[PDB]
Design a protein around this ligand. Structure first.
Ligand SMILES: O=c1ccn([C@@H]2O[C@H](COP(=O)(O)OP(=O)(O)O[C@H]3O[C@H](CO)[C@@H](O)[C@H](O)[C@H]3O)[C@@H](O)[C@H]2O)c(=O)[nH]1
Ligand SMILES: O=c1ccn([C@@H]2O[C@H](COP(=O)(O)OP(=O)(O)O[C@H]3O[C@H](CO)[C@@H](O)[C@H](O)[C@H]3O)[C@@H](O)[C@H]2O)c(=O)[nH]1
Ligand SMILES: [Cl-]
Ligand SMILES: [Cl-]
Ligand SMILES: [Mn+2]
Ligand SMILES: [Mn+2]
Lengths: 280, 280
């Protein structure tokens, strides 16, 4: 391991050991989903055998899907929750960060696990491998995954971290959509909008609790949707905006423009959601 | 055009018109090269027909090649200049920015044109298309190229510019290796090290002379060496470091680390070369 608790190899914990270690703590699993009809069922099925055992609760956080995502998830026995149902007093904003933040209001596990719903054949041990350090460690409040090409991660986020928060240089996949954390931690932190949510959570956690509260576990290999370069441009812009803000640097608020030769401007947001705590 | 003089279409100027417009001004062409034996001859040949006419001078700036770059360039009739010969009183540093800066001491054109030496079948009109606005415009001191996937450009540089210098959002290929500028401008500016040199030159030019001094011309389509993702990681890191510095933001000076699972740290430099002017 580096100065960051890193599980480099297959965790050795059995499902039954992990379950014993809960000690009254509960576990929620959240799957955010926007138009993932092709992969959603495989993801739910990888995890539903854990329900009523290690996992106390599983939801799909449907983020405005217009395909068959919701019906197929229901048919896999999952509880599907819209953004509106998760938190109906508050009008819905677009983007991933909004979905995860709302999901805090729709779950009650002491521990919350996020798994992206666009994964291709995910391992059924993903969730156990992630909760290990939270269950059996001390002071770990956040566990990030890593894996084996991560264009935004390797060109934008990791190099920017080296520039502005080099202490986090040892985190191999800071933008990974698969991770777990304590409710106490998550409901105490703001949530960046859009694709800024992961990078925001990591830096805030570090700034507030330091490295000793963070672990990372090998999930082996991951496959997912490969988005077009232009969609990555918009994602990177939001990651940059969120990353700059945590480092005390003013962002223009100006969206990325691209020329296809036609021109298009993508939205960027400088507005975080506050800690879900204030909503109590 | 946008607020930035943009030549969207094939320039209409003939080689003879352009030559007339020189009016005593001279033109140097510089080809930086590090191990480009496969493509260097095609690039030189695309340009050497202009020599003693529109172009007064052509050099290859050899940046420590250990392949056959120099012998093949000589065999194409090019003058080849090492980093050491360009400026022998000053010990040589690694990276592209060093090569271009040194090239100022090895040329005397009032106008300097840079063309990367790894281009696959470059158009023989590249150089005329670039000098057009400098020759026939007023107050233009810098001309950048654009083209048609630019991973570092679209994920790192363009989104970072939108964040920190949104006025430059209209520049389509800020990192393009093909561009031209006045000696008066170039010898008045510092040169960022490594791959930071292009982004550094653009921001300094803008900060010092504003947009009205900058033009961009369509070169159509370009092909070149596609580097592995890890090499791009190091390039992006240096672009970020240089970009952050021009915007008044402190960089850690810490190199990007990558885990292949073995670990490697890449060099980054926070040291610019001063304006070549001080070397007079
Ligand atoms: O508005 C949205 C956008 C995405 N998602 C879901 O979020 C997950 C990941 O989104 P994706 O479009 O696949 O983003 P990636 O290109 O994969 O981005 C990677 O890097 C991002 C930057 O941190 C992370 O947010 C992602 O989890 C991570 O997979 C998917 O299951 C989506 O269904 C939503 O629920 N709502
Ligand atoms: O130490 C070096 C490195 C590169 N080069 C030359 O510079 C040119 C471009 O370098 P390259 O390795 O192809 O960089 P790219 O991946 O193509 O980077 C693009 O984006 C960079 C960031 O601004 C620019 O520096 C480049 O010109 C541009 O092609 C090539 O002809 C090389 O021969 C050197 O002379 N010395
Ligand atoms: Cl608090
Ligand atoms: Cl000056
Ligand atoms: Mn994905
Ligand atoms: Mn190249």
């Amino acid at each position: 391991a580096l100065p960051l608790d890193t599980t480099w190899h297959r965790p050795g914990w059995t499902i039954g050991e992990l379950e014993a270690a809960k000690a009254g703590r509960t576990i929620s699993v959240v799957l955010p989903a926007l138009n993932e009809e092709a992969t959603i069922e495989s993801v739910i099925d990888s995890i539903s055998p854990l329900v009523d055992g290690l996992v106390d609760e599983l939801i799909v956080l449907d983020s405005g899907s217009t395909d068959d995502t919701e019906i197929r998830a229901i048919a896999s026995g999952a509880r599907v929750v819209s953004r509106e149902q998760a938190l109906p007093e508050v009008p819905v904003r677009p983007g991933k960060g909004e979905a995860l933040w709302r999901s805090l209001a729709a779950t009650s596990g002491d521990i919350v696990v996020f798994i992206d719903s666009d994964l291709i054949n995910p391992h059924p041990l993903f969730v156990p491998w992630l909760v290990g350090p939270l269950l059996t460690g001390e002071g770990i409040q956040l566990v990030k995954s890593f894996y084996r090409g991560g264009r935004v991660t390797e060109l934008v986020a990791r190099p920017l971290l080296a520039a502005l928060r080099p202490e986090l240089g040892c985190v191999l996949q800071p933008l990974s959509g698969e991770y777990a954390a304590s409710r106490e931690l998550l409901t105490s932190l703001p949530f960046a909008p859009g694709y800024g949510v992961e990078i925001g959570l990591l830096i805030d956690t570090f700034d507030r609790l330091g490295l000793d509260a963070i672990a990372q576990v090998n999930l082996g290999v991951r496959a997912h949707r490969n988005r077009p370069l232009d969609e990555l441009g918009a994602m990177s812009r939001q990651v940059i905006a969120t990353l700059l803000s945590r480092c005390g640097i003013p962002d223009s608020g100006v969206g990325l423009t691209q020329f296809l030769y036609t021109r298009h401007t993508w939205p960027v947001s400088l507005v975080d959601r506050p800690p879900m705590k204030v909503m109590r």
